[PDB]
Design a protein around this ligand. Structure first.
Ligand SMILES: *[C@@H]1O[C@H](CO)[C@@H](O)[C@H](O)[C@H]1NC(C)=O
Ligand SMILES: *[C@@H]1O[C@H](CO)[C@@H](O)[C@H](O)[C@@H]1O
Ligand SMILES: [Ca+2]
Lengths: 331, 61, 445, 146
């Protein structure tokens, strides 16, 4: 409530592929907490081919309970009879203290780089008190908690920007949660939020293999050298496969092509983040807090989230070698 | 025998097979796994002649 | 002699404490500074759980913050409750269902709750009829109002006030207290058994029997009954209270005499099936048996003299004072009333409409309400074995024989030894001039 | 306040970092966090120990691990375990589930397609919860298309 609600939609074609340059619009009805409702002004935008995602932002009256947005597609060729229409619903953060929290930026780059200090804008809308003691944040990744942060809050502005240094441990992806505590006359109530953090894929120890003779094409049977290069002592496992093996059939995918993405499955929580009260945002981030202030309901065990002789055949060069710093082999 | 049905074909498995004449399949189950083979024997009295086994295919047969 | 102290286990979190209990042995009889020294002692502990109601399955959803799970689709309308304070969620934001604004029964809580057979008091909330069930049902009454909405738990309800006394006039059921079924089947208890009456009423008599001291104390009683409502509870499925179910949810799976015994103490031994609510005018009077001989003997007669409001029978029965003084009208009177200028009885008669009470009640065991919970069957049987050992504590045995055919009773830690008419004072210390001390009838044992 | 954050689900045979934060006071008190079995009463899997100071700015984390000390048989074992925190100003406990899924396994075959009467080169890349090599025994089973 009081904070503009981001809506990012993406259109896919018949089989699992994004489309772009396709105009889309949405209609929404904002309802008041007390009763009745109000019709929100429709917004229209197109999906960029570069980004792949269409972006929308809706600012609602402070008395809104929940909002419903119906996404429809618009094209000059498109008839109203045959079209694409999908209705959706979003429920507000529930707080008896009326206080909320929100974070911005985070991967719009797209994604992120390593070693660079990143800043995130936060806002404490509708506080019980504008004065907040201190800001606390917990960055987690790979189903574990990597770092524990602490910050200070000042009256200099309505929204404060926090700087988070990125680490090598977070390489595949990450999540960050920011919680601030308040002291009531009776019981304390803390508010938080969490957003998925995507980051460039970079190995802890960079491995680069390059042939010593540099040429566009090599003559058959030519003795050639191969060079391994690593940051730290590492074991290498080489495989030299013909390009003709795939081949049969249907592209035969790739040898691996997905590792960090498979390593990304380690995340306990599901979705980008955010949830009912303090609890649901934590459990959706993959954590469960223990505190005096707020009570944590576990919703039992259940996790609904799923996707939410010769010459010469293949193959050769099947070996395992130790590579202290740089190492080279000749064949 | 509750109606149910217990069968989940998303798990991809075979139903209980029908034995040859004079029946008698051992280790009776309601649902068999794919790749599992169940031996068949004869009632009193006969003798099994030939290769006696039933293997569950990827398809339900 | 009380008993040895029990160990502490299975923390409270709902109550956020650690408690123990001590058993009592050889209750006080004739005196000697009785037990006192509170049986249950509470100690601060560290809560493991969040004090929520736990439920198995609930595949059909939609769960509540309390965890009642509400099998059907309640959300979001109309009443949006499922526990305090209305647990939200449910609502919002979508209106609406069950419109037209029906008014609830002033007191639905007394038809709820539960009754302790041995203590004779409505110990704690069990039923909680506030659950709507998603169905809109209402009954209309005479004088009120507007219609009145019916709770889901109650099978049938109606306002049967008719034929102005008549009933309360044919009442008072004149009785002189002195020295199926059957009455022997009421001893093991275990519901009905046609528990509809079968004797009653609520016992405040501990003060009356104690007042039997120094006097022969012959008693007389008159009672009026006005039934404002007649209700019946659906016995198939019931929606339990958040409070009762909470204490029921958290229990040791293994059998524990101590813990389970607290259930009957807190929530009561039985729950109401059928029965009616209203108010009653009950009064008990005490007279010296020496007075009946001096003022002349009228048995069936003078029992009609109790009616009065609004020289033999002319002035008597609670002296004015002077006008009845010669004809006596002594001595002590107690209030057995239950429920609730000019016409004082009419003052509380309108008050009983505002704040009623359960008058004629029929009950069923509390063990029948343990259905459909986690480890239901296990806790049912364990509760049966608990009540059996619990009833043993109250049933008088060790109270010892009282001379002159006196029957011992049991109130808390004291027996009180109720003596038959013709006995002088409590504890059966002395005998009246009627000269019959012979009786001394036998009992178990 | 004393907010203690952990993963929603503990992982058997893994290093699980537990973080604690305080409201702060003129007095600096030490804290202790540990993982105790459902038989509370009586056993202890592991014990972490921390120290609080103005230098630490009243926040610190110590890693906790659960070794395969679980009872033999009765598969699946444990599920679940208890988490505790003992400090001067506060003491609190909570029950948390466990999972026997730990680390990652990548199977690498030399070729995507093989001809009959041909050997299949295979190697597996094993990793810890910390992504370290995690030297462990591994079984490799092959299954027909049938
Ligand atoms: C009064 O109540 C009983 C329930 O206690 C009810 O079942 C019976 O029908 C009632 N009496 C009349 C005259 O309707
Ligand atoms: C024998 O048995 C019961 C209770 O013991 C009653 O019949 C009577 O009190 C007697 O003592
Ligand atoms: Ca409802």
């Amino acid at each position: 409530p009081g904070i503009p609600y981001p809506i990012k939609v993406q259109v896919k074609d018949s089989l699992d592929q994004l489309v772009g340059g396709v105009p889309v619009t949405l209609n929404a009805q904002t309802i008041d907490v007390n009763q009745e409702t109000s019709d929100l002004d429709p917004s229209k935008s197109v999906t960029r081919v570069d980004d792949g995602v269409a972006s929308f932002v809706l600012n609602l009256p402070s008395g809104v309970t929940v909002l419903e947005f119906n996404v429809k597609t618009d094209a000059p060729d498109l008839p109203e009879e045959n079209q694409a229409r999908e209705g959706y619903r979003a429920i507000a953060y529930s707080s008896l203290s009326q206080s909320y929290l929100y974070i911005d930026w985070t991967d719009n780059h797209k994604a992120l780089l390593v070693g660079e200090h990143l800043n995130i804008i936060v806002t404490p809308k509708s506080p019980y008190i504008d004065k907040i003691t201190h800001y606390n944040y917990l960055i987690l990744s790979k189903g574990k908690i990597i770092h524990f942060g602490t910050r200070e809050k000042f009256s200099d502005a309505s929204y404060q920007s926090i700087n988070i240094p990125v680490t090598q441990n977070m390489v595949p992806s990450s999540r960050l949660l920011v919680y601030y505590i308040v002291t009531g006359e009776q019981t304390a109530e803390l508010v938080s939020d969490s957003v998925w953090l995507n980051i460039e894929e970079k190995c802890g120890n960079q491995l680069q293999v390059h042939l010593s003779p540099d040429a566009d094409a090599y003559s058959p049977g030519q003795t050639v050298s191969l060079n391994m290069a690593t940051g730290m002592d590492s074991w290498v496992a080489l495989a030299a496969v013909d390009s003709a093996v795939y081949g049969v059939q249907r592209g035969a995918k790739k040898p691996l092509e997905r590792v960090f993405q498979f390593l990304e499955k380690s995340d306990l929580g599901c979705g980008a983040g955010g949830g009912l009260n303090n609890a649901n945002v934590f459990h959706l981030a993959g954590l469960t807090f223990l505190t005096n202030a707020n009570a944590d309901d576990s919703q039992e065990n259940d996790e609904p989230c799923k996707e939410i002789r010769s010459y010469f055949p293949e193959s050769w060069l099947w070996e395992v070698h130790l590579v202290p710093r740089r190492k080279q082999l000749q064949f | 025998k509750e109606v149910d049905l217990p069968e989940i074909e998303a798990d991809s498995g075979c139903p209980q097979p029908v034995p040859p004449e004079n029946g008698f399949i051992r280790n009776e189950k309601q649902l068999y796994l794919v790749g599992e083979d169940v031996e068949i024997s004869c009632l009193t009295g006969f003798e099994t002649v030939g290769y006696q086994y039933f293997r569950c295919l990827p398809d339900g047969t | 002699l009380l008993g040895d102290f029990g160990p502490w286990s299975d923390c409270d979190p709902c109550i956020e404490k650690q408690s123990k209990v001590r058993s009592v042995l050889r209750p006080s009889q004739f005196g000697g500074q009785p037990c006192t020294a509170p049986l249950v002692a509470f100690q601060p502990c560290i809560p493991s759980k969040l004090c929520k109601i736990e439920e198995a399955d609930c595949k059909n959803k939609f769960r509540c913050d309390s965890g009642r799970c509400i099998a059907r689709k309640l959300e979001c309308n109309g009443e949006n409750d499922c526990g305090d304070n209305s647990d939200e969620r449910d609502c919002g934001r979508t209106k609406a269902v069950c419109t037209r604004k029906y008014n609830p029964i002033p007191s639905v809580q007394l038809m709820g709750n539960g009754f302790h057979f041995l203590a004779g008091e409505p110990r704690g909330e069990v039923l909680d009829n506030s659950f709507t069930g998603g169905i809109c049902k209402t009954v209309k009454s005479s004088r009120t109002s507007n219609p009145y909405r019916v709770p889901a738990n109650l099978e049938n309800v109606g306002f049967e006030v008719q034929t102005a006394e008549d009933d309360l006039k044919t009442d008072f059921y004149k009785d002189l207290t002195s020295l199926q079924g059957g009455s022997s089947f009421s001893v093991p208890i275990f519901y009905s058994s046609k528990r509809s009456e079968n004797i009653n009423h609520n016992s405040a008599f501990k003060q009356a029997i104690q007042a039997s001291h120094k006097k022969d104390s012959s008693f007389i009683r008159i009672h009026k009954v006005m039934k404002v409502l007649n209700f019946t509870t659906k016995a198939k499925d019931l929606h339990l209270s958040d409070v009762f179910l909470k204490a029921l949810n958290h229990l040791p799976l293994e059998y524990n005499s101590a813990l389970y015994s607290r259930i009957f103490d807190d929530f009561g031994t039985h729950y109401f099936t059928s029965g009616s609510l209203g108010g009653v005018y009950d009064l008990l009077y005490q007279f010296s048996s020496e007075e009946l001989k001096n003022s002349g003997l009228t048995e069936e007669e003078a029992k009609h003299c109790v009616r009065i409001e609004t020289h033999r029978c002319t002035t008597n029965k609670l002296s004015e004072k002077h006008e009845g003084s010669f004809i006596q009208g002594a001595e002590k009177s107690i209030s057995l009333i239950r429920g609730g200028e000019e016409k004082t009885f009419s003052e509380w008669l309108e008050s009983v409409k505002e704040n009623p009470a359960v008058i004629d009640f029929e009950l069923a065991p509390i063990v029948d309400l343990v259905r459909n919970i986690p480890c239901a069957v296990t806790k049912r049987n364990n509760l049966r074995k608990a009540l059996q050992e619990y009833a043993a504590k109250f049933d008088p045995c060790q109270c010892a024989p009282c001379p002159n055919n006196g029957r011992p009773t049991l109130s808390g830690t004291e027996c009180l030894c109720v003596c038959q008419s013709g006995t002088y004072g409590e504890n059966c210390e002395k005998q009246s001039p009627d000269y019959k001390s012979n009786a001394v009838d036998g009992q178990w044992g | 306040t004393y907010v203690i954050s952990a993963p929603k689900i503990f992982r058997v045979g893994a290093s699980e970092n537990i973080v604690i934060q305080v409201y702060g006071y003129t007095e600096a008190f030490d804290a202790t966090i540990s993982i105790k079995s459902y038989p509370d009463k009586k056993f202890s899997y592991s014990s972490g120990h921390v120290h609080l100071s103005s230098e630490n700015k009243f926040q610190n984390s110590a890693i906790l691990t659960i070794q395969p000390k679980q009872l033999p048989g009765g598969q699946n074992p444990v599920s679940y375990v208890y988490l505790e925190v003992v400090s001067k100003h506060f003491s609190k406990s909570k029950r948390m589930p466990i999972t026997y899924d730990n680390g990652f396994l990548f199977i690498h075959t030399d070729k995507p397609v093989y001809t009959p009467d041909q050997s299949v080169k295979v190697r597996v890349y094993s990793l810890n919860d910390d992504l370290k090599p995690a030297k462990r025994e591994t079984v490799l089973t092959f299954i027909d298309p049938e």
